[PDB]
C-alpha cells in the first residue's frame with residue numbers, strides 16, 4: 373500500500389540523503405530499503421533518519437555488496453513485500469591519476485563496483501519488474517559519463533559504460549513498463565600520494581596532474597552541490613508521469629557538453645576541455 | 651625510415667586485413683607486427699600476406715593476450731626498432747543476449763578484453779610515445795559505443811567505455827604531439843532456460859532487425875582499413891573517424907536530445 377524503494381550505498385552521501393529524504397516524505401508513501409556495503413557503518417544513516425522523524429517501519433537497512441551475486445540475491449530475499457517499485461543503483465568509486473601510474477587491481481575494482489555492479493542488480497531485479505509491467509530504476513550518473521576528463525580515464529570509462537548499458541535497456545524496456553533513468557551530477561559535497569607518484573610517470577605528465585588537481589579544487593569550491601539538492605532530483609524523476617532517460621542536477625556543464633554533441637569528430641571538445649583545464 | 655605499427659587481434663577481420671594493407675602498401679614504408687591471441691590461428695594472416703606479396707620483414711607476427719599484461723610486456727620487448735609509431739587496439743569481443751541471460755565470467759570477460767585490455771596497452775606503449783613527443787594510437791570503435799542497442803547492453807557498455815577512456819586521454823595528450831583516434835565501424839562482414847518468454851520472443855525480433863541491417867549496410871574490412879590509413883596519414887588527426895555515414899541521423903538525433911528520450915523512441919520503433 374506504499375512505494376517500495378531500494379537504494380545501494382546508503383552509508384554516506386547521496387544514497388544516505390536519498391534514503392532519509394524518502395522515508396521522511398510527508399506523503400508517507402515510501403517504504404525504503406537502504407542497503408549498505410558494511411552495516412557496521414550504518415550510524416550516520418540512522419542519526420540522519422532519527423533527526424528527520426522517519427515514521428518507523430518506514431526505513432530498513434539491509435546488507436548488500438554489489439561485487440557479490442549472493443549478497444545481491446540475499447537482499448532481494450529480505451524484501452518482505454515481495455516487490456520493488458523503485459530501484460536506485462547508486463554505489464560507485466572514482467580513480468584518479470595518470471593512466472600509467474594506475475594499478476591494474478584498482479582498474480578492476482572501479483569496473484566491478486560501477487559497471488558490473490549495476491549489472492547484478494538489474495539482473496536480480498528487472499525480471500520481476502518486467503513480469504509486473506511496472507517499475508522505475510534510477511541510476512546515479514556523472515558528468516564524467518557524459519564527456520571525457522583528463523586524469524580520470526578509468527573512472528570515465530566506467531561512467532560512459534553505464535550510460536551505455538542503460539540507454540541500451542531503456543530502448544528495450546519501453547513497452548515493458550519499466551522506466552530507467554540517469555541522474556547526472558557534477559561535483560557533490562560531503563566530499564595515493566605524490567611520493568610514489570613521480571615515480572610511476574614522466575615529469576610533464578606530473579606537472580600536469582598538478583594543474584589538474586589545482587583546477588578541480590577551484591571547481592569543487594565554485595560548483596559542488598549539497599547531497600540534499602541532488603537527492604531532490606531523484607525524487608522528481610520518480611514523481612514524473614513520463615520519465616525521460618536523463619536528468620541533470622545542474623546546467624553548469626551544459627555548454628562544454630553541447631560542444632561535444634555539435635562536433636562528433638570531437639576536436640572542439642578536446643581543445644575546449646583542454647583549455648578549460650590547463 | 652619505416653613506420654613501426656603494432657596490431658592487436660590479427661587472426662581475422664579488421665586486424666588481419668589492416669596488417670596486410672600496411673605490410674604491402676606500394677610505399678614500402680610500414681613495418682608491421684601483427685599480434686594474435688594464439689598463433690595456431692595464423693595460416694590466414696600468412697596466406698593473406700602471401701596473397702599479397704608482402705616483402706620479408708614488412709610483417710612479423712606475435713602472440714599477445716590483451717587480458718594478460720606480462721604478455722603485453724612480452725610483445726613490447728619484441729619491437730627491435732625500440733619505438734612504436736602507430737598502435738592499433740583492435741582485439742575485441744561481442745556479447746549479445748538478454749541482459750539476465752548473461753554469464754558473470756562473460757560480462758567480466760567482455761570488459762577485461764575490450765576496456766581493460768586497451769588500458770594495458772596504452773599503459774605499456776604511451777609512456778615511450780610521450781617521451782618522444784610522437785605517435786599515433788588508433789582504436790577500433792563501434793556505433794554501439796556511440797549509442798545504445800537492444801540486447802547488446804553489455805557490449806555497448808564496453809564500447810561507450812573505450813570512448814570516454816579515449817576522450818580523457820585525448821585531452822591530456824593534445825600538447826604531447828601524440829595522437830589518438832577512434833574508427834567507428836557500423837557492421838563489418840540455454841537462452842530461454844535463462845530468460846522469460848516475451849524477452850525471448852523479441853530477441854528474434856531484434857536479430858531479424860540486424861540481419862536486414864547488415865544486408866543493406868555491411869562494409870568489408872578492406873573498406874574499413876582505408877579509414878585506418880586515412881586517419882594515420884592525417885597531418886592534424888581528429889579523435890573520431892566514421893567508417894560510414896548511415897548512422898549519423900540516429901546519432902544527430904541522440905545528440906539533439908540530451909534528455910535521452912527521443913533517441914530511445916526513435917530506436918525503439920526502428921527495431922520494433
Ligand SMILES: NC(=O)c1ccc[n+]([C@@H]2O[C@H](COP(=O)([O-])OP(=O)(O)OC[C@H]3O[C@@H](n4cnc5c(N)ncnc54)[C@H](OP(=O)(O)O)[C@@H]3O)[C@@H](O)[C@H]2O)c1
Nearest residue numbers: 381382383384385386387408409438463464512557559560
Ligand atoms: N560525490 C560527488 O561529487 C558526485 C558527483 C556526481 C555524481 N555522483 C554519483 O553518485 C554516486 C555516489 O556518490 P555519493 O558519494 O554522492 O553517494 P554514495 O551514496 O555515497 O555512493 C558512493 C557509495 O558507493 C557505495 N559502495 C562502494 N562500494 C560498494 C560495493 N561493493 N557494493 C555496494 N556499494 C558500494 C558506498 O557505501 P555502501 O557501504 O553503502 O555500499 C558509498 O555510499 C556515484 O555513482 C556517482 O556517480 C557523485
Ligand SMILES: NC(=O)c1ccc[n+]([C@@H]2O[C@H](COP(=O)([O-])OP(=O)(O)OC[C@H]3O[C@@H](n4cnc5c(N)ncnc54)[C@H](OP(=O)(O)O)[C@@H]3O)[C@@H](O)[C@H]2O)c1
Nearest residue numbers: 659660661662663664665686687715716741742835837838
Ligand atoms: N566485425 C564487425 O562487424 C565490426 C563492426 C564495427 C566495429 N568493429 C570493431 O573492430 C574490432 C575487431 O573486429 P573485427 O572482427 O572486424 O576485427 P579483428 O581484428 O578480428 O578483432 C577481433 C579480434 O580480437 C582478437 N582478440 C580476442 N581476444 C583477444 C585477447 N585476449 N587478446 C588479444 N586479442 C584478442 C582476435 O584475434 P587475435 O587472436 O588476434 O587476438 C580477433 O581478431 C572491435 O574492437 C570492433 O569494435 C567490428
Ligand SMILES: C[C@]12CC[C@H](O)C[C@@H]1CC[C@@H]1[C@@H]2CC[C@]2(C)[C@@H](O)CC[C@@H]12
Nearest residue numbers: 514515516521558559587588591648649
Ligand atoms: C570530476 C568533477 C568532480 C566529480 C564528479 O564526478 C564529476 C565532475 C565532472 C566535472 C569536473 C569535476 C572536476 C573538475 C572538472 C574537470 C572541470 O575542469 C570541468 C569539469 C569538472
Ligand SMILES: C[C@]12CC[C@H](O)C[C@@H]1CC[C@@H]1[C@@H]2CC[C@]2(C)[C@@H](O)CC[C@@H]12
Nearest residue numbers: 792793794799835836837838859860863
Ligand atoms: C553490433 C554491430 C556489429 C559489430 C560492429 O563492430 C558494431 C555494430 C554496431 C552497429 C550494429 C551491428 C549489429 C546490428 C545493429 C545492432 C542494428 O540494431 C543497428 C546497428 C547495428
